[PDB]
């Protein structure tokens, strides 16, 4: 948006970027589901790992999210609710077990990885607000799933919080 009205990298004009940014989500999704839960007693090198995997799914969520603001064309914020649910029922079926399972030793790395999510659940919140002010026929009907959904993970937060 700063050099052309075309990029530092071919290919990147402003209808393609359409395709980029679906892509870029898709295959974000597709990384954020590979994170599985192990037990208890799994190893601190394993844990450590696959938290910070963890993090790092879920910083690209938030750059991912934030790159949306200034784009328009609503099939992009379409595909954004279509894919980010499935984000967070990854989110919700795979981490939050973990979260269970290494807390009393990983306190620091457990707050920074809901520190990181929180910031992306409020984005999701403005996305869904800007999706239901626009009264469109294709964005309001995956809203309020991922309404309950919302409040099913900062539930399942107040309850990790005791």
Known sequence: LINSPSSTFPTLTRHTFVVFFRVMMAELEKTVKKIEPG?????????????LYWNMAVRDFSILINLIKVFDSHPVLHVCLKYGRLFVEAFLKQCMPLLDFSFRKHREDVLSLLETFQLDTRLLHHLCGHSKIHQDTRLTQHVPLLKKTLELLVCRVKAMLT
């Open 39 to 51: 037990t208890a007693a799994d190893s601190q090198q394993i844990h450590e790992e696959k938290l």
